[PDB]
Amino acid sequence: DLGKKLLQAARAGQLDEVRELLKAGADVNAKDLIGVTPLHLAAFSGHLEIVEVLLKASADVNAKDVSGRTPLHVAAKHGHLEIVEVLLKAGADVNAKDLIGFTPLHLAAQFGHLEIVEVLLKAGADVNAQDKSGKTPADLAARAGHQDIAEVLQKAA
């Protein structure tokens, strides 16, 4: 199972092994049971070089796991600014919504990643996007105590 070994290499941050498995024929979009792909796992663990290798191998940058999250959601939630930037350059959907209505901007605002908030805004993120409870990214920032981010977002409204 090359797909499973690729999921493990991507999660573990094994750059050489990811390249060899891709050359051997591993499905770049292999999925585990919750539907996460090697791109999701590399974004999760902050492995920038693996993300770039996966993108060059035509990984689907907007693949959604069963929660509806894309790799951009993952990278934005976990603070990985360089990965957010490379995903955006590859065509990641800055306004993709998961099953609770969160965009990547919701997650960057909720988890207090101001630099990522600024990058997403430069990429056209919708500041007025509402989740399924009606809440905007600025609402989430305020709720989590990140007043500087809420001010930036309310300024951009």
Residue numbers in the entry: 13 to 169
Share the article's original sentences:
We established a process to generate bispecific designed ankyrin repeat proteins (DARPins) that simultaneously target HLA-I/peptide complexes and CD3e. In this study, we developed and characterized bispecific T cell engagers by combining two highly specific DARPin molecules to target the tumor-associated HLA-A∗0201/NY-ESO1157-165 complex and CD3ε. We demonstrated that DARPins can serve as a novel scaffold for TCEs that combine high specificity, potent T cell activation, and minimal off-target activity.
In contrast to antibodies and TCRs, DARPins do not contain cysteine residues. As a result, they can both be readily expressed in soluble form in Escherichia coli at very high yields and exhibit favorable biophysical properties.
